[PDB]
């Protein structure tokens, strides 16, 4: 890719790969494109930085349906580190990527027998369970794993997503509360919890959804989803025929402020880039949904 | 038959191919064979069982279509598993909601098995609303205006790696300056015929 539609040094490629590693991006094609070149034409330049790149490129190639590079990287990693446990996990993932689940299960059982306090093998077994569509067994195994190993946020988020996919929202809301308690400075969790509470039930659930949408918008002022949700929840609560006058007028005031902010934001957006297609349209949405 | 046009098919294929590991869905519009569609608007990818953003998107798209004299008539979805092509509760709910404002609405399911690179088949399942349920009206029909041109254009667009410029409603919510009408895809399909 160097001198090929781009002009970057090997340091720039390494930094881009590291940044793609920090945030869990899953653009397999670009990762493979950069990684194969980095492995081939700059192997000696990287003193000790090639093993994590090997792992990342192998995973991306497995995701990209290109197994020759995966096998090459796996062979290199196995040759460098004999008897390691991460390499066994990679081998199991390669096995299960070809719809060979019994071998992966026996490999993970062997890993757990060698070391009983290992975490990745249990997660891979749960992934194997999920790959076959067996949702209830996966949920049960994930619940057992969380019972054994609490404080793992990835498992909590995965369980919340699985519960969302099954149209069971109370337990998903509980899991999102558990996630939000550890990370009170993250607006995305508040936004998702507000969405779940909006989708769950009726009046008090809508009140909590509005509260957490407001909290998410307070944490970050660039969150347009939070603003839209706040406006929609305020409008929904205002028109409910089982609310007192005080709550009705408070929600009307909230909706008016939200609509004004939305209109100002869309005017700001239209000022820079000239399209003028939604500023003429969002106003109609605001007008037709008034009161 | 419903006789999908070329732009809708190409945009659907591009949206399905942009996020292979996720589940994607969008909307189908028609002008105010049986009912000729004009184009499609991709709505969401990832987790789809959430109400508020779907409602906001539906309202905005309905208002925009009403401005330009269109009508929402179809709903297309693609699952995540490669061996799963049956409708779920969300698709049935959305299609039933749409059906109350327009007759003989379409429920389109993308088939992952026939999702080959260039073309092997239209890789589309069409469901029609009969009484209170949906039935697969698939008499091995041809739900396209002209299959050879459509498949050739879709194959060329896929080979050209042109799905990196497609933008759906989620990308519009992430940054307002994006456009969900996709003028670039329209220009590309107009030039490439």
């Amino acid at each position: 890719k160097v001198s090929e539609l781009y002009d970057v040094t090997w340091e720039e490629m390494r930094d881009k790969m590291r940044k793609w590693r920090e945030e869990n991006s899953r653009n397999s094609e670009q990762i493979v494109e950069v990684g194969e070149e980095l492995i081939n034409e700059y192997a000696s330049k990287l003193g000790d930085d090639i093993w994590i790149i090997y792992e990342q490129v192998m995973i991306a190639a497995l995701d990209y349906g290109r197994d020759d590079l995966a096998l090459f990287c796996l062979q290199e990693l196995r040759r460098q580190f004999p008897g390691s446990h991460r390499v066994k996990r990679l081998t199991g993932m390669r096995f299960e990527a070809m719809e060979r689940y019994d071998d992966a299960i026996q490999l993970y059982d062997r890993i757990l027998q060698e070391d009983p306090t290992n975490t990745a093998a249990r997660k891979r077994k749960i992934a194997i369970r999920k790959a076959q569509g067996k949702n209830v067994e996966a949920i049960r195994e994930l619940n057992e794993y969380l019972e054994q190993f609490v404080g793992d946020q990835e498992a909590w988020h995965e369980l919340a997503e699985l519960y969302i996919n099954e149209h069971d929202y109370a337990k998903a809301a509980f899991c999102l509360e558990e996630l939000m308690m550890t990370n009170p400075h993250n607006h995305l969790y508040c936004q998702q919890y507000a969405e779940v509470k909006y989708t769950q039930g009726g009046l008090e659930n809508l009140e909590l959804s509005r509260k957490y949408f407001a909290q998410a918008l307070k944490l970050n002022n660039r969150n347009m989803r939070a603003l839209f949700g706040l406006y929609m929840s305020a409008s929904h609560i205002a028109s409910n025929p089982k609310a007192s006058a005080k709550t009705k007028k408070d929600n009307m005031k909230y909706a008016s402020w939200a609509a004004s902010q939305i209109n100002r934001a869309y005017q700001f957006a239209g000022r820079s880039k000239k399209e003028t297609k939604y500023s003429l349209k969002a106003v109609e949405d605001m007008l037709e949904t008034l009161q | 038959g419903v006789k999908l046009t070329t732009q809708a098919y190409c945009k659907m294929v591009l949206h399905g191919a942009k996020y292979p590991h996720c589940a994607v869905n969008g909307l189908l519009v028609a002008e105010k064979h049986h009912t000729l569609f004009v184009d499609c608007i991709p709505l969401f990818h990832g987790t789809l069982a959430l109400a508020p953003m779907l409602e906001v998107a539906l309202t905005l798209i309905d208002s925009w279509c009403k401005d330009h004299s269109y009508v929402i008539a179809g709903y297309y979805q693609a699952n995540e598993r490669v061996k799963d092509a049956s409708p779920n509760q969300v698709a049935e709910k959305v299609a039933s909601r749409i059906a109350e404002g327009f007759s003989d609405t379409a429920l389109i399911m993308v088939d992952n098995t026939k999702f080959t690179m260039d073309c092997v088949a239209p890789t589309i399942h069409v469901y029609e609303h009969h009484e209170n349920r949906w039935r697969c009206r698939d008499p091995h029909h041809d739900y396209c205006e002209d299959w050879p041109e459509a498949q050739r254009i879709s194959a060329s667009l896929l080979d050209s790696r042109s799905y990196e410029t497609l933008v759906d409603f989620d990308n519009h919510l992430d940054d307002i300056r994006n456009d969900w009408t996709n003028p670039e895809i329209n220009k590309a399909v107009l030039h490439l015929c």
């Binding site: 609490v150 149209h167 069971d168 028109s239 | 109400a51 309905d62 709910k93």
Partner: peptide, 21 residues
């Protein structure tokens, strides 16, 4: 608010339901 509106309807460690004022 109107027209387009969809209703989806259908033991992690601690889970209780009632009172505790």
């Amino acid at each position: 608010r109107f027209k387009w509106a969809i209703e989806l309807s259908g033991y992690p460690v601690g889970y209780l339901d009632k009172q505790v004022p």
